[PDB]
Amino acid sequence: QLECRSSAEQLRRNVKMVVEPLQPRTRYQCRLLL
Amino acid sequence: TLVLAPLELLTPPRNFSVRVLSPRELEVSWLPVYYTLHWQQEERRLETAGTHRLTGGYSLWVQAHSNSSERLHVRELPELQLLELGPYSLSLTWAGTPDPLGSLQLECRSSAEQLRRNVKMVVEPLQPRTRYQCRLLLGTAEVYETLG
Numbered sequence: 001q002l003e004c005r006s007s008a009e010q011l012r013r014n015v016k017m018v019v020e021p022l023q024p025r026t027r028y029q030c031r032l033l034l
Numbered sequence: 035t036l037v038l039a040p041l042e043l044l045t046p047p048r049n050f051s052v053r054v055l056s057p058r059e060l061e062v063s064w065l066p067v068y069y070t071l072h073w074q075q076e077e078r079r080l081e082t083a084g085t086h087r088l089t090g091g092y093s094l095w096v097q098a099h100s101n102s103s104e105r106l107h108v109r110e111l112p113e114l115q116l117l118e119l120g121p122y123s124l125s126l127t128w129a130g131t132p133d134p135l136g137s138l139q140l141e142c143r144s145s146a147e148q149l150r151r152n153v154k155m156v157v158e159p160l161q162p163r164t165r166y167q168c169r170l171l172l173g174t175a176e177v178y179e180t181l182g
């Protein structure tokens with residue numbers, strides 16, 4: 001899985017991977033979880 | 035004379051704490067013999083001290099066997115009501131008990147995405163015409179379909 005956490009939202013996507021939707025001009029820390 | 039067999043004879047609970055995890059689930063934690071945990075609404079035998087989970091106003095005490103510790107007094111969530119249904123957002127509301135919680139979050143999981151929002155709460159952005167099961171984490175899950 002790929003987890004992208006921002007200051008207001010956190011999205012985990014089951015898995016290359018496309019994370020959508022995301023907020024514009026927002027920083028997110030993304031990591032891979034096995 | 036005759037020397038006989040030398041015989042061995044064997045003769046509180048340090049800082050017991052209670053954490054409210056869920057509406058039927060409490061987390062007990064105590065340090066140092068067995069222990070007896072008593073919980074009364076306003077006993078369970080354990081072999082070792084540490085952390086345990088009590089399932090199912092409450093005064094709790096732990097006895098080390100024999101003295102006991104101090105009695106700690108501690109304190110169901112409502113279902114999710116849809117306040118606003120949109121194509122890219124969902125505003126939901128719940129009353130809840132008036133108690134302070136360290137964590138209170140709303141989790142909405144769809145077939146392709148899962149979003150957890152730190153908490154009424156508005157979940158945005160969401161996919162249009164997508165069904166998501168939303169629940170409260172400190173609960174029951176409610177399925178809601180977004181607009182198109």
Ligand SMILES: *[C@@H]1O[C@H](CO)[C@@H](O)[C@H](O)[C@H]1NC(C)=O
Nearest residue numbers: 046047048100101102103104
């Ligand atoms: C049990 O605990 C209390 C409080 O710590 C203490 O005063 C008491 O001496 C203990 N009892 C025994 C028999 O050691």
Ligand SMILES: *[C@@H]1O[C@H](CO)[C@@H](O)[C@H](O)[C@H]1NC(C)=O
Nearest residue numbers: 048049050051052053063065
């Ligand atoms: C446990 O440790 C000390 C011992 O007095 C106390 O001050 C503290 O509040 C206790 N912690 C919890 C979580 O009960």
